[PDB]
Amino acid sequence: SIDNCAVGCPTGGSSKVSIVRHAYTLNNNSTTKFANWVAYHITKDTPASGKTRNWKTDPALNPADTLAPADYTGANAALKVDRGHQAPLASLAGVSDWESLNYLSNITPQKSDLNQGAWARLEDQERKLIDRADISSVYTVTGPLYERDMGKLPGTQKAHTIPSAYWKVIFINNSPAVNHYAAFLFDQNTPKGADFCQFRVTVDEIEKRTGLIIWAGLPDDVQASLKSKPGVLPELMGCKN
Amino acid sequence: SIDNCAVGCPTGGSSKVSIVRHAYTLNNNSTTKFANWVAYHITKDTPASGKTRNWKTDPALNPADTLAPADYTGANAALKVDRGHQAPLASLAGVSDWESLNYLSNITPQKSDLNQGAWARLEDQERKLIDRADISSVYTVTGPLYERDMGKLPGTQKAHTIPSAYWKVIFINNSPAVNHYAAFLFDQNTPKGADFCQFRVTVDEIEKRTGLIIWAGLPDDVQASLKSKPGVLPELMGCKN
Ligand SMILES: [Mg+2]
Ligand SMILES: [Mg+2]
């Protein structure tokens, strides 16, 4: 009874069932150990600052199909990665199941310079959209890409696949059929000082690279036309051209 | 009490007072003899087909400040122009004062190849938007450019200025601050078989070439960012890239 997608959650996830929470809807990958996609819905009631971060194994998954906190030991030192959120904590932690934002189904080993740099700056602008009086929702889908060998977490024996990049698809209010939208894609090795505005892409590129269909409930004609056209939502997020 | 603009009618027109009708809001130019801009609001209830075209002098204007039917005598033979509508007849002819769509304040001498070609095909797609279940309004502003000498109507003694080009700025539903938008600009000499999708521009370009501020009630930051960025509404009208 919770719809975190509005226009249909993505198809093409490796799991036929998705986890549905107030914080987000997520589709796990038991092979990579990370979520294929995470969909969430920011409203005026969802942001909450200063929450704590008790990393925890997601109790709704089989423990063999996801990571545990122990699996991150030594990762920062060896790989210069953080425990990076997919659905962002500060944008969503006002919901009733907020601690699930720190479940490791919502985390990947994300390069620190990306997590703390352009990815964070994009999160900040994404969240700020909800402060506009005429913006009542931000609906986002985010996830990883696996396109090159990224090495392995040193602290685990579990088979897993570290992402090589991350993507984020955003629209406001009711539907990208009528409302502004955006899509971004960042390599893991994006420089710390990068401008997130330089990473705009089409939804079609993300779909072709991921094997997903985003906004899967839209009419075919809407999908074809809008997914090959970069959106204008980034212009409201401080981007030029 | 009638709001044909939603987000503020344009500023900068030569007349300090505009004519407000159910069919449109119009700002006349007593020097050129044509409207500086015409703003209108298509809904599911506004289109009507097959209405006739009884051209008439606008009774709300001083006759010296506008054209009369006699003024068009011989114009097609001299200049290959038609009596071209600014606010489109078929999209608006169901309104309560529809005959005002054929008042000459809503008409200019528009090259036949443009009127019957790309301009008409844009009108058709603009009108078709309202058939979509999720589109409840189309708000448009249209008007001329005055940049080169296009000749004089042979049938009048009045000083007048034939337009050199025509533009159309469109958005759907509530506001371009949140909804898709488009802008188009066509020279008078546009070839008959031209594809209207090849004439997309920014709102900023139209403003700079007219002295107007369109959507003048939007916040400054919304104006600055969106007006320099071509919109995505044309993708819903059959256009690509
Ligand atoms: Mg982060
Ligand atoms: Mg016409």
Resolution of the model in angstroms: 1.1
- Ligand 1 centroid – CA B122 distance (Å): 45
Handedness of CA A196, A199, A200, A201 (dihedral sign): negative
Closest CA relative to residue A105, chosen from A174, A51, A169, A56? A56
Q: Give the total residue count for chain B.
A: 241
Distance in angstroms (rounded) separating the CA atoms of residues A47 and A127: 8
Going edge to edge, which strands form the sheet with A138-145?
A19-20, A25-28, A35-42, A138-145, A165-172, A181-187
Query: Can you read off the two tokens belonging to residue A95?
Result: 């919901």
> What one-character-per-residue DSSP string does chain A give?
---SSSS-PPB--SSSS-EE-SS-EEEE-TTTSSEEEEEEEE-TTS---S-----B--TTS-GGGS--GGGGTTHHHHH-EEEEESS-HHHHTTSTTGGGGGBGGGEEEEEHHHHTTHHHHHHHHHHHGGGSTT---EEEEEEEE--S-----TT--S-----SEEEEEEEETT-TTTB-EEEEEEETT--TT--GGGGB--HHHHHHHHT-BSSTTS-HHHHHHHHTS--SGGGGGT---
CA nearest to B227 within chain A: A235
- Residue A215's CATH number: 3.40.570.10
Give the distance from CA A42 to its chain's centroid. 13
| A216 near B CB under 8 A | no
Distance in angstroms (rounded) separating the CA atoms of residues A37 and A25: 8
Cα distances (Å, whole numbers) of residue A239 to A117, A165, A198, B225: 16, 21, 9, 8
Closest CA relative to residue A192, chosen from A108, A104, A105, A82? A82
Cβ atoms < 10 Å from Cβ of A63: 11
Distance in angstroms (rounded) separating the CA atoms of residues A141 and A120: 16
- Ligand 2 centroid – CA A131 distance (Å): 43
* DSSP 8-class letter at B162: -
Cα first-last separation, chain B: 39
Query: Can you read off the two tokens belonging to residue A140?
Result: 């986002």
Closest CA relative to residue B200, chosen from A232, A227, A162? A232
Distance in angstroms (rounded) separating the CA atoms of residues B101 and B92: 8
- Ligand 2 centroid – CA B18 distance (Å): 22
Distance in angstroms (rounded) separating the CA atoms of residues B28 and B108: 12
For residue A185, give how far its alpha carbon lies from the nearest alpha carbon of chain B (Å): 20
Please check whether residue B222 is in contact with residue A236, taking contact to mean a CB–CB distance below 8 angstroms: yes
- Ligand 1 centroid – CA A203 distance (Å): 22
* Contact across the interface for A236 and B229, Cβ inside 8 Å: no
Please check whether residue A182 is in contact with residue A200, taking contact to mean a CB–CB distance below 8 angstroms: yes
| A235 near B CB under 8 A | yes
Domain count, chain A: 1
SS3 state at B173: coil
Distance in angstroms (rounded) separating the CA atoms of residues B97 and B87: 13
Pick from A178, A222, A231: which is nearest to B173 by CB? A178
Q: Give the total residue count for chain A.
A: 241
| A195 near B CB under 8 A | no
SS3 state at B139: strand
* Contact across the interface for A178 and B180, Cβ inside 8 Å: yes
Give the distance from CA B82 to its chain's centroid. 15
Q: Which domain holds residue A177?
A: 1-241
Residue matched to tokens 């269909």: A213
- Looking at residue A172, its amino acid is I
* Contact across the interface for B134 and A178, Cβ inside 8 Å: yes
Distance in angstroms (rounded) separating the CA atoms of residues A143 and B201: 34
Please check whether residue B19 is in contact with residue B66, taking contact to mean a CB–CB distance below 8 angstroms: no
| Gyration radius (Cα) of chain A, Å | 17
Tell me the helices (H) and strands (E) count for chain B, helix number first.
6, 8
Q: Nearest 5°: phi and psi at B68?
A: -120, 160
* DSSP 8-class letter at B10: P
SS3 state at B44: coil
Distance in angstroms (rounded) separating the CA atoms of residues A84 and A95: 20
Distance in angstroms (rounded) separating the CA atoms of residues A39 and A169: 9
Q: Nearest 5°: phi and psi at B58?
A: -70, 120
Please check whether residue A199 is in contact with residue A185, taking contact to mean a CB–CB distance below 8 angstroms: yes
Distance in angstroms (rounded) separating the CA atoms of residues B117 and A83: 58
Q: How many CA atoms lie within 13 A of B149 on its CB side?
A: 3
Distance in angstroms (rounded) separating the CA atoms of residues A171 and A140: 7
Cα distances (Å, whole numbers) of residue A152 to A148, A156, B103, B211: 12, 8, 74, 61
Distance in angstroms (rounded) separating the CA atoms of residues A179 and A189: 32
For residue B84, give how far its alpha carbon lies from the nearest alpha carbon of chain A (Å): 30
CA nearest to B234 within chain A: A225
Distance in angstroms (rounded) separating the CA atoms of residues A141 and A218: 15
β-partners of residue B181 are: B171
Distance in angstroms (rounded) separating the CA atoms of residues B75 and B153: 6
Residues near A214 by Cβ (< 8 Å), separated by ≥ 6?
Answer: A10, A37, A141, A169, A203, A206, A207, A227
For residue B176, give how far its alpha carbon lies from the nearest alpha carbon of chain A (Å): 9
Query: Can you read off the two tokens belonging to residue A189?
Result: 């090795």
* Contact across the interface for B135 and A229, Cβ inside 8 Å: no
Please check whether residue B78 is in contact with residue B151, taking contact to mean a CB–CB distance below 8 angstroms: yes
